Amino acid sequence: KLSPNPPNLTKKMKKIVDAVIKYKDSSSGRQLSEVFIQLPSRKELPEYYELIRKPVDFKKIKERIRNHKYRSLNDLEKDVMLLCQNAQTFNLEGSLIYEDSIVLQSVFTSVRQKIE
C-alpha cells in the first residue's frame, strides 16, 4: 500500500494511457492497442512466459496507475516502452504485432508531449 500520488498526476497518467489505448491506425482504423490489453495466461501461451522476463499489458499498466506504483510520468513511460520492447522480442520484424508496437511507442511519446 503505497502513499497516494497527487490526484493531478494520477489523472494525467490515466489520460495518457487512455489516449494510447483508443488510438486508431491511420489507414485501417484498427485499434492498435487491442492485442496488448490483456496477456494470454501462462497455460494459453507458455512460450511467451518462457522468453519474456517481465510481461506487461495495458491492464497491468492501469493497475500500476491505480495503485500509485508509478511515481512520475517517467515511471509510466518506462513500462509502456517495456510493453513495446517485449512485443519486439516475441514477434518478428515485419509482423503486424511488431510494427504495431513501434507505432504505439510513437503514440505514447506524442500524447505525453501534448498532455504536458
In whole angstroms, the minimum distance from the beta carbon of 61 to ligand GJN comes to 10
Q: Which residues contact 5 (CB under 8 A, 6 or more apart)?
A: 13, 68, 70, 71
Sole window of 1-9, 11-19, 70-78, 90-98 interacting with ligand GJN (rule: CB under 6 A): 90-98
- Can you tell me the distance from the alpha carbon of 60 to that of 38, in angstroms, rounded to the nearest whole number? 8
Instruction: By CB under 6 A, name the one of 9, 73, 96, 97 that touches ligand GJN.
Output: 97
Given its phi and psi angles, is residue 68 left (phi above 0), alpha (psi -120 to 50 degrees) or beta? left
Q: Does 99 engage in binding with ligand GJN (CB under 6 A)?
A: no
**Which residues would be at the binding site for ligand GJN (CB under 6 A)?**
35-36, 38-40, 45, 57, 87, 90-91, 97
